[PDB]
Paper text:
H18 has mild neutralization activity towards wildtype, Alpha, Beta and Delta SARS-CoV-2 authentic viruses, it also possesses activity to trigger conformational change of SARS-CoV-2 S and exhibits inhibition activity in the S-protein-ACE2 interaction mediated cell-cell membrane fusion assay.
During the first 3 years of the pandemic, the spike (S) protein on the virus surface has been actively undergoing antigenic drift generating a large number of variants. Being a highly dynamic protein, SARS-CoV-2 S-protein has been observed to adopt RBD “up” and “down” conformations. We provide evidence to suggest that the identified class of antibodies constitute a potential immune pressure driving the genesis of S371L/F-S373P-S375F mutations in Omicron variants.
Residue numbers in the entry:
A (entry chain C): 356 to 551
B (entry chain E), E (entry chain P): 1 to 224
C (entry chain D), D (entry chain O): 1 to 110, 118 to 220
The structure:
């Protein structure tokens, strides 16, 4: 998701008092409303309760290094919460998919949708689940009767972009005092002019 | 900047309704979207979180202290107060009203801690005895003198020298239990031996529960 | 049911580096922010570090925090120990709408033991004697360490009962203060020729004697 | 102040390998012997390991335990999960003349017959009427899922006062069972022409009726 | 081998004295040099250690349960008993007596667990009422019948059909809190309607929390 030409208030996003976890690096959480950037990227995905610790800059595992890499210069903001009452149902239903097998590492902020069967040995299988040829897509373990470590958590990543553009998405003051008949400086979305 | 001041009765009666109010000077409660919380700390133990509040009706409480904490905010007086029910002897803790912005972050500003402890009932009349200095009572160029506070009940007693004029060298000792119930302590001040016969030293022992104020002059010992 | 496990006592010499742990039981340390607090004895606490990698304006650069989510223990690395650093350390978490603090690490003290026992004595006053009472007061001040032994002495046999001493207590000049009292009858005060209070501290003994004059 | 930290909920599919931990807070996990107990629901606990590596005579060899003393955690490895393995697991310690048990780990395994609830209604008895009491009992049994709502009716008016219902509970044949009780006065029982209990499950409504005869 | 069996009532009122004795068969208390320990387990909670005893006077107790556990051993009767003082509603746990094989080790043999319930009110006897089947009580080739347990205090109650001879189709429902203090439940059995008027159905309600063994016969409803 891309946020553009919209004013955003992050105070309502914090006063919900329902999120289980909140990790927000790069910028201090109390002073990100006044500071503004150009574009805000929202990446939403589901994950298990034991893999929420893997989502951090400088971690190694089986999900972060194969699905969504976190670089060292990660100024994103991670929000997740417990949604077991809606994302899971009885009957052993999961309705979500992950990737476990890959040939090598991938670049950060890259989406991998390849369904090719990962070959382990030197013998090709011609696209079947033969020996040394395992499908890289596996089933979840979501269940409403589990505990707290395997629950469905909806992780959203709110990253920021550093590039030359006027701040379309920002949290500034809505209206300062209005002064007339004196030589003042104003910024009315198109100029930096000093005059009466 | 801003500062926080607590008020309300420090001592607490058993099984009753506690009333501690924390006031804010130099800022506004409603402005800034600001949170308010209370934190207690027993002597010698760790900090314990009681609950947090918003300037609206939103609030949350510790499950160990659930259904016992009642905190309300009035914007007109710019303060917030906490009410505790069914207080026991294990609730003796130093209460801090906590100023914080981030609910998951830090308490950047801390108010001064008010001492809350179970109140006493029984009371006895105090007694004050002077401690006359002499040539054996000094070791070098400095001498020692004081007053003896013995056979009083209950705690505490406040001892001041020359109505608080003398503070340097004044040592107040904690009280200890006697052989039979009562308490005893002393308060002394170290002065040079040259000012023994030329300066008058008067101790002021105050016992608020017994409503007794005793002023005792300290003079060098007269041999008889 | 999420708590922060913290060591009770951590003691090292000044000038070295230390590590203070804060272990979470159920929830992972990377789930929520961890805040450390440094509090002088008998005062309001002060935040020494927050957001797990950045220092507030006012504290030195020696206060550093590190997070290793594999072991679920929040670490606070402190180097270059000084005199003012003696305090209790508490780590804070949030869990889920319920702020949970740590157990508490009282950082111990730390050159020379400032042993200057001011053993002053006073005889019972005449006003106390007129009230059919007598009390001998033994006072020690400006001594270190706070571990002294007191034993009331006199010629013949001073009374065993009425001996009442106080535990050492910190003074304003970082030293210790303590007292000792001897309840006595007026007849026994003149029964013996003299009374003496001795204090044993670090092997040395300072003794003064009183007499009814 | 020594306690054993144990995971509350552990789930694993049959035929795989799972590890159950037991972490000590203050004392090291190698200080004292740790014993694991596997207790069936509604049954006495039974010991499955001893001396942290030795299996008693009777338990299978899969109950293997390992000690990670560096992390102060006691580990119990289970291989080849089966149906009978579903039981509570507790770890034991001794500390210093004070036995301390663990938090508790329940082994969770990983077909279900879905059925309509059989509804039975029972009018109040004559013996109860002679005791100046009356009760209407509505029965809900052999149903899936365990989510049923009850609504008593007096001829055509719904009844809410005196209505007591039971949460669904699993039966022996994998289905669920429930009940609803309607406390009533003897005068109110004969005041209305008939009474009925409407048990609605999976949308379908099954209704029975009773009359004073 | 050896076996440990508990005895005593399954009920204790709050602020009273508990008296449970665990008897021994197939062994001797003094011989073997082993230890006796009492362990409790609340429903849905972990095991809790109460204390341990030797066949001499050596005792050790949980600091959380200190100054309230009194356990004594009588060698003549080949048993040992535990006495608990100032019991509260939070002491509802399943009590186990086990021979401690090694002091820091395992309890090799565990006795069967007796259930203890504590609640702060006077015990009330159950009122057993018959549940007469009729034409409206059957759906197809099978009918249903049961017995009603109403206004009893406290849990638990067990219901057996034909002195335990009927187990198939018997459904015992968990207790539910009534509008006024007491509990209520029922136990029903599904039977074909052919044997409704040819065989007698008798339910056996046991309420050792409030005594009163009651036998109630179940008969088809007669229109009056």
């Amino acid at each position: 998701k891309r946020i553009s030409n919209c004013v955003a208030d992050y105070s309502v996003l914090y006063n919900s008092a329902s999120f289980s976890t909140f990790k927000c690096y790069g910028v201090s959480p109390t002073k990100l409303n006044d500071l503004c950037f150009t574009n805000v990227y929202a990446d939403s995905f589901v994950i298990r309760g034991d893999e929420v610790r893997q989502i951090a800059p400088g971690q190694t595992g089986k999900i972060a290094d194969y699905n969504y890499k976190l670089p060292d210069d990660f100024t994103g903001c991670v929000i997740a919460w417990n949604s077991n009452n809606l994302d899971s149902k009885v009957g052993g239903n999961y309705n979500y998919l992950y990737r476990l097998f890959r040939k090598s590492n991938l670049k950060p902020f890259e989406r991998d949708i390849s369904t090719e069967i990962y070959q382990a040995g030197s013998t090709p299988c011609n696209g079947v689940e033969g020996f040394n040829c395992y499908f890289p897509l596996q089933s979840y373990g979501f269940q409403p009767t589990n505990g707290v470590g395997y629950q469905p958590y909806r992780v959203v990543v709110l990253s920021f972009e550093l590039l030359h553009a006027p701040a379309t998405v920002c949290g500034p003051k809505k209206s300062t005092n209005l002064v007339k008949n004196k030589c003042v400086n104003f910024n009315f979305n198109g100029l930096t002019g000093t005059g009466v | 900047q801003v500062q926080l001041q607590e008020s309300g009765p420090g001592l607490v009666k058993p099984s009753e309704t506690l009333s501690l109010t924390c006031t804010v000077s130099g800022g506004s409660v409603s402005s800034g979207g600001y949170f308010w919380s209370w934190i207690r700390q027993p002597p010698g133990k760790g900090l314990e979180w009681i609950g947090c509040i918003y300037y609206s009706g939103s609030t949350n409480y510790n499950p160990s202290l659930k259904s016992r904490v009642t905190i309300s905010v009035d914007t007109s007086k710019d303060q917030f107060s906490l009410k505790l029910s069914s207080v026991t002897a294990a609730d003796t803790a130093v209460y801090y009203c906590a100023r914080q912005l981030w609910l998951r972050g830090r308490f950047d500003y801390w108010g001064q801690g008010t001492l809350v402890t179970v109140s006493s009932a029984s009371t006895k009349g105090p007694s004050v005895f002077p401690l006359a200095p002499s040539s054996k009572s000094t070791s070098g160029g400095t001498a020692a003198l004081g007053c003896l506070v013995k056979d009083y009940f209950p705690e505490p007693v406040t001892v001041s020298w020359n109505s608080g004029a003398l503070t340097s060298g004044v040592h107040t000792f904690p009280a200890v239990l006697q052989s039979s119930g009562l308490y005893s302590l002393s308060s002394v001040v170290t002065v040079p031996s040259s000012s023994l016969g030329t300066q008058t030293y008067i101790c002021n022992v105050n016992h608020k529960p017994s409503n007794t104020k005793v002023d005792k002059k300290v003079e060098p010992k007269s041999c008889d | 049911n999420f708590m922060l496990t913290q060591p009770h006592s951590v003691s090292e010499s000044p000038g070295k580096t230390v590590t203070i742990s804060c272990t979470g039981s159920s929830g992972s340390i990377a789930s929520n922010y961890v805040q450390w607090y440094q509090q002088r004895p008998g005062s309001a606490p002060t935040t020494v570090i927050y957001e797990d990698n950045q220092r507030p304006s006012g504290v030195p650069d020696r206060f550093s925090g590190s997070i290793d989510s594999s072991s679920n223990s929040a670490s606070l690395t402190i180097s270059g120990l000084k005199t003012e650093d003696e305090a209790d350390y508490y780590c804070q978490s949030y869990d889920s709408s319920n702020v949970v603090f740590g157990g508490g690490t009282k950082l111990t003290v730390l050159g020379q033991p400032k042993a200057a026992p001011s053993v002053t004595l006073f005889p019972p006053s005449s006003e106390e004697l007129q009230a059919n009472k007598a009390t001998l007061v033994c006072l020690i001040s400006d001594f270190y360490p706070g571990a002294v032994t007191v034993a009331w002495k006199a010629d013949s046999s001073p009374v065993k009962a009425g001996v009442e001493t106080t535990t050492p207590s910190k003074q304003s000049n970082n030293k210790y203060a303590a007292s000792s009292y001897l309840s006595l009858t007026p007849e026994q005060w003149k029964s013996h020729r003299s009374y003496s209070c001795q204090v044993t501290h670090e092997g040395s003994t300072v003794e003064k004697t009183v007499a009814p004059t």
